[PDB]
Design an enzyme around this catalytic site. Structure first.
Site, mmCIF file in Angstrom:
data_model
loop_
_atom_site.group_PDB
_atom_site.id
_atom_site.type_symbol
_atom_site.label_atom_id
_atom_site.label_comp_id
_atom_site.label_asym_id
_atom_site.label_seq_id
_atom_site.Cartn_x
_atom_site.Cartn_y
_atom_site.Cartn_z
ATOM 1 N N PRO A 45 0.808 -1.214 0.000
ATOM 2 C CA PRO A 45 0.000 0.000 0.000
ATOM 3 C C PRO A 45 0.839 1.262 0.000
ATOM 4 O O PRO A 45 1.949 1.302 0.534
ATOM 5 C CB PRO A 45 -0.825 -0.116 1.265
ATOM 6 C CG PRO A 45 -0.992 -1.581 1.449
ATOM 7 C CD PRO A 45 0.284 -2.224 0.940
ATOM 8 N N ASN A 57 -8.757 9.772 -1.464
ATOM 9 C CA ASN A 57 -9.150 8.977 -2.616
ATOM 10 C C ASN A 57 -8.595 7.575 -2.453
ATOM 11 O O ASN A 57 -7.389 7.417 -2.305
ATOM 12 C CB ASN A 57 -8.620 9.608 -3.930
ATOM 13 C CG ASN A 57 -9.366 10.881 -4.320
ATOM 14 O OD1 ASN A 57 -8.764 11.872 -4.761
ATOM 15 N ND2 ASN A 57 -10.650 10.861 -4.165
ATOM 16 N N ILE A 106 -3.507 -3.078 -3.632
ATOM 17 C CA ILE A 106 -3.996 -4.206 -4.425
ATOM 18 C C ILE A 106 -4.954 -4.979 -3.515
ATOM 19 O O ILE A 106 -4.524 -5.714 -2.619
ATOM 20 C CB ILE A 106 -2.825 -5.107 -4.886
ATOM 21 C CG1 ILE A 106 -1.885 -4.312 -5.801
ATOM 22 C CG2 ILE A 106 -3.341 -6.412 -5.568
ATOM 23 C CD1 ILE A 106 -0.503 -4.945 -5.963
ATOM 24 N N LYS A 115 -1.327 -5.809 5.653
ATOM 25 C CA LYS A 115 -0.157 -6.039 4.789
ATOM 26 C C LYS A 115 1.172 -5.885 5.549
ATOM 27 O O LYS A 115 1.222 -5.193 6.565
ATOM 28 C CB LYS A 115 -0.226 -5.134 3.563
ATOM 29 C CG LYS A 115 -1.449 -5.439 2.696
ATOM 30 C CD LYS A 115 -1.197 -5.301 1.218
ATOM 31 C CE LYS A 115 -2.484 -5.585 0.430
ATOM 32 N NZ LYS A 115 -2.292 -5.614 -1.051
HETATM 33 O O1 LIG Z 1 1.371 2.615 -4.841
HETATM 34 C C1 LIG Z 1 1.486 1.613 -5.511
HETATM 35 O O2 LIG Z 1 2.079 1.681 -6.691
HETATM 36 C C2 LIG Z 1 1.015 0.339 -5.007
HETATM 37 C C3 LIG Z 1 1.909 -0.205 -4.200
HETATM 38 C C4 LIG Z 1 1.658 -1.497 -3.564
HETATM 39 C C5 LIG Z 1 2.761 -2.253 -3.183
HETATM 40 C C6 LIG Z 1 2.620 -3.494 -2.577
HETATM 41 C C7 LIG Z 1 1.358 -3.995 -2.334
HETATM 42 O O3 LIG Z 1 1.213 -5.225 -1.742
HETATM 43 C C8 LIG Z 1 0.179 -3.175 -2.742
HETATM 44 O O4 LIG Z 1 -1.070 -3.628 -2.520
HETATM 45 C C9 LIG Z 1 0.358 -1.937 -3.358
#
Ligand SMILES: O=C(O)/C=C/c1ccc(O)c(O)c1
Lengths: 118, 117, 114
Positions: C1, C97, C64, C32
């Site tokens: 994230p 957002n 994700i 996470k």
């Molecule tokens: O900001 C982004 O480009 C997303 C990054 C990201 C990185 C690792 C993860 O497990 C996820 O859900 C999102």
């Protein structure tokens, strides 16, 4: 609605009144009360448009609804005209990304705009 | 296409021709004329990746089309390659968000890229 | 994230430990691992919210999965709480957002998450 402008125009070139004018004109264009409108202007950026460092802008407009073919064309005419007149940026050196946000995906005031389910 | 890099690397560490390099490389990678490519680099940011302030980068690539599984892995190798070589950022401390934009949702030149309806 | 905060609050008002707290609390809320959480804070911005320049924040959270009705309300309560306590920003002057990213549309380590 939320409007963000990133630009290589220097801070000293952003006129007094710019954020208020954007707030007012966006409220008018979207038919939304101005209390909802957020505006964010980021000058002095390191940017190129077509490989050239002449004034330019990269922008986004996020809204829950009021996004679509004809609407976005009207917003572009409004916002490009403002960027041209106020910041002296040529409209062909401006990009605006439009995002039609779902109410469930906009956080505000400890919650989101989706109050109906789950 | 529009490429944005946010990084905690300082301004003095961004090479003089980096914006030009990103522009030419993205033109070639996407098969679009360089006139349409916009690049934006934001150094000196207050950011952390996995709780650490070692060099990192948060990026976005917006395009009308030319976004997808195979293309994005190709863009990632290219862009991470450039960030590592030029800005000295480890590839495992870079995120790139890819956005496939509809033509109707991209404003330019008083209008949008949707001229048909 | 990936969590980003843009605010007109000055840099001097961002407390020691703020990025670490965001990282830890996002790890807790999203489940996470903290090793993959990226946080980015941008103070001293030229911004207005409802036509006023009192403290305000424009934020984004990309993940994700883990994005949805109830989860987003929980994220908003957590993140507005932190912005209120730490940066003294009223929750009704914050927008966040939320983006549910497809793994093929997130680049990392010369490749993607797909
Ligand atoms: O900001 C982004 O480009 C997303 C990054 C990201 C990185 C690792 C993860 O497990 C996820 O859900 C999102």
């Amino acid at each position: 609605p939320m409007f963000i402008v990133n630009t290589n125009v220097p801070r000293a070139s952003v006129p007094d009144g710019f954020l208020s004018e954007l707030t007012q004109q966006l409220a008018q264009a979207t038919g939304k009360p101005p209390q909802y409108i957020a505006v964010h202007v980021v000058p002095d950026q390191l940017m190129a448009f077509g490989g050239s460092s002449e004034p330019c802008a990269l922008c986004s407009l996020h809204s829950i609804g009021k996004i679509g073919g004809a609407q976005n064309r009207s917003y572009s005419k409004l916002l490009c005209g403002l960027l041209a007149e106020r910041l002296r940026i040529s409209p062909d050196r401006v990009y605006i990304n439009y995002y039609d946000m779902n109410a469930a995906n906009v956080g505000w005031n400890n919650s989101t705009f989706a109050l109906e389910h789950h």
